[PDB]
Amino acid sequence: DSRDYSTELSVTVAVGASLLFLNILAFAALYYK
């Protein structure tokens, strides 16, 4: 097997970024008086 970690790392950081984007969206919505 090709011992390379590109696709797995990419999808991992993509999902992490999506979750954090939703969380900061919630935070900004709360702090938008």
Binding site: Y5, E8, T12, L19, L22, N23, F27, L30
Partner: protein, 193 residues
């Protein structure tokens, strides 16, 4: 204004609960999956090892990954640092599942009180996860990890081995736990308004 305010608060609360379940799933996945650190091109042997379970290779043009390690048997764990990291991750999982239970208290108890209770327990779970991820690096100096990776590997020294998706997923879990806990703190304060 009041109806919009109440609807927004309810929607954000439901979203916070959904992401809390997601964080619990992430905690379970990182604890169960043994893919914290793994081999590289230059590693003497292939393999991958998590908090307690490790599957090093055989070393003859082959797969031959020998999965030994179980948290239920502390002897099989290579290092006391590994034991402590597994214990802290387990405590964080216990706390977050404690909140998946305490969501039931919203029926009767005060909304601000329940929100604060999980805001504090989510903060504690994030602290435990930070402690676990900070103490897990100390265990690479053990003989098994040294044989797995190489002589360059040491305390807070990867050497040639590479962090796989579970470690970075743990870091995302830590920072998401922190932001979720702060969201919970402010939500609980916002219920009283």
């Amino acid at each position: 204004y009041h109806e919009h305010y109440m609807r927004n608060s309810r929607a954000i609360g439901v979203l916070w609960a959904i992401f809390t379940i997601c964080f619990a799933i992430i905690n379970v996945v990182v604890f169960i999956q043994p893919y914290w650190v793994g081999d590289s091109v230059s590693t003497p042997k292939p393999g991958y090892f998590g908090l307690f379970h490790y599957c090093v290779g055989s070393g003859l043009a082959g797969r031959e990954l020998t999965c030994r390690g179980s948290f239920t048997d502390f002897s099989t764990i290579p290092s006391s640092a590994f034991k402590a990291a597994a214990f802290f991750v387990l405590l964080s999982m216990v706390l977050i599942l404690g909140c998946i239970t305490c969501f039931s208290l919203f029926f009767f108890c005060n909304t601000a009180t329940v929100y604060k209770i999980c805001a504090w327990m989510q903060l504690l779970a994030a602290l435990c996860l930070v402690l676990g991820c900070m103490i897990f690096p100390d265990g690479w100096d053990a003989e098994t990890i040294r044989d797995m990776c190489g002589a360059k590997t040491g305390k807070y020294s990867l050497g040639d081995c590479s962090v796989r998706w579970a470690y970075i997923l743990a870091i995302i879990g830590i920072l998401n736990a922190l932001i979720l806990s702060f969201l919970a703190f402010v939500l609980g304060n916002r219920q009283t308004d």
